[PDB]
């Protein structure tokens, strides 16, 4: 169960590039490093971090990175491959049918920094008050998946150093699942028969502190089985501390 | 004045009648194509296209064979088809963020094979309980279907006294066995035996099916499936080939 998921984050963070898209975590990272480049890249917040690739990557341009994550089982493979050197990973094939992988931390250009990261388990929409002080907060496919994004979209700014960024991923995949439809940032027709985008929605709640600075589309492909695969394509937000 | 669908039968229409995504020829047309060409030296007089939703497949065949039945097991489905057939239009809802929608109108006249529809009949019905009348055929296609199945061998094993002698069985599917769709007892394959081998679905349905067929061909067919605006399903099917006797 956990482990599937995990399995699952394992082979997307640290896999092979599937229909010409490329990593998604070395992409946002890389993308994240040039939006912030004037900025002194001395300590980095990276939420939901799932197996770590994003704060290995974002590692090699700052100087501290906190990779956390709610389930304290992707925590603990990111751990395991940052301590351990590897972890191993079940590849899903046809229907039941798996197929095993070694993920070694001395095959990527990240393994120059990777001692610069801490994992920790917890939740966005309430950190603990030792994350702050922090350059850029990323938060990669995470808003769609909180039970309150505003809990986090609201606060955040109290985490971030001046002229610091916060930048955002989302597909925008609202589901009740996960979010109370009352808590949508968008995708949703309001009272006034409107219809929201979370774009829109995000720019209500974050231009009081933050300014959106860029947005560009980022797809992503995860594996499922060896045919079935989920292609989506996330937007990026950037929002620069005002 | 159109006829609308719901979102199930919706997210058909899109995927058979709406635009390609991410350069991906469109599932249906493919299909069909392909199965004209692996019959080229066949007659083409009737085609079977079991599980063809909202009618694409069927209305492709129909620009090679003289006669195509299209049979699905959802009466919503056959519907659909059915009044774009008749009416020549039918609309349908695309998924956006969240729980917005657009929609969209399908017009026969903006599709080529506006020349053959006449040439299609579509029935509700069941590929593991075929009437006697769908009998005869010289292509029986069923696609991403087997997987969708509870016991996805009661088609196969009997499917050979449906087509006629030189006749094909071409399947599609990316073998997504689902207990919930499949009693593990009768995935054909994607599981390990009680030997410890693993068991390939291509090496199960050469099995079942080379007792009244033989492997002509496979390949390699992909698709995608919006499911919003920015979420999509990319799968790569397996097109088998099957020639009778």
């Known amino acids: 169960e956990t482990?599937?998921?995990?399995?699952?984050?394992?082979?997307?963070?640290?896999?092979?590039?599937?229909?010409?898209?490329?990593?998604?975590?070395?992409?946002?990272?890389?993308?994240?490093?040039?939006?912030?480049?004037?900025?002194?890249?001395?300590?980095?917040?990276?939420?939901?971090?799932?197996?770590?690739?994003?704060?290995?990557?974002?590692?090699?341009?700052?100087?501290?990175?906190?990779?956390?994550?709610?389930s304290q089982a992707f925590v603990d493979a990111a751990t395991e491959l940052?301590?351990?050197?590897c972890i191993g990973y079940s590849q899903n094939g046809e229907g039941e049918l798996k197929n095993y992988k070694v993920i070694d931390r001395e095959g990527y250009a990240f393994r120059d920094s990777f001692?610069?990261?801490?994992?920790?388990?917890?939740?966005?929409?309430?950190?603990?008050?030792?994350?702050?002080?922090?350059?850029?907060?990323?938060?990669?496919?995470?808003?769609?998946?909180?039970?309150?994004?505003?809990?986090?979209?609201?606060?955040?700014?109290?985490?971030?150093?001046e002229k610091g960024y916060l930048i955002l991923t989302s597909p925008y995949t609202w589901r009740e699942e996960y979010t109370a439809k009352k808590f949508w940032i968008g995708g949703y027709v309001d009272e006034n028969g409107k219809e929201v985008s979370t774009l829109e929605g995000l720019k209500e709640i974050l231009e009081i502190?933050?300014?959106?600075?860029?947005?560009?589309?980022?797809?992503?492909?995860?594996?499922e089985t060896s045919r079935k695969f989920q292609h989506t394509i996330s937007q990026m937000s950037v929002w620069k501390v005002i």
């Open 82 to 85: 940052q301590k351990n050197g």
């Open 115 to 161: 001692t610069k990261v801490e994992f920790f388990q917890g939740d966005a929409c309430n950190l603990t008050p030792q994350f702050k002080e922090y350059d850029l907060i990323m938060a990669t496919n995470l808003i769609d998946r909180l039970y309150e994004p505003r809990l986090f979209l609201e606060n955040i700014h109290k985490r971030i150093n």
């Open 3 to 70: 482990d599937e998921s995990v399995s699952q984050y394992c082979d997307f963070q640290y896999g092979e590039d599937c229909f010409g898209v490329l990593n998604f975590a070395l992409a946002c990272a890389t993308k994240a490093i040039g939006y912030t480049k004037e900025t002194p890249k001395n300590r980095a917040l990276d939420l939901g971090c799932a197996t770590g690739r994003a704060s290995f990557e974002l590692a090699r341009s700052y100087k501290h990175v906190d990779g956390v994550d709610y």
């Open 209 to 223: 502190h933050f300014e959106l600075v860029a947005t560009e589309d980022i797809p992503f492909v995860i594996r």
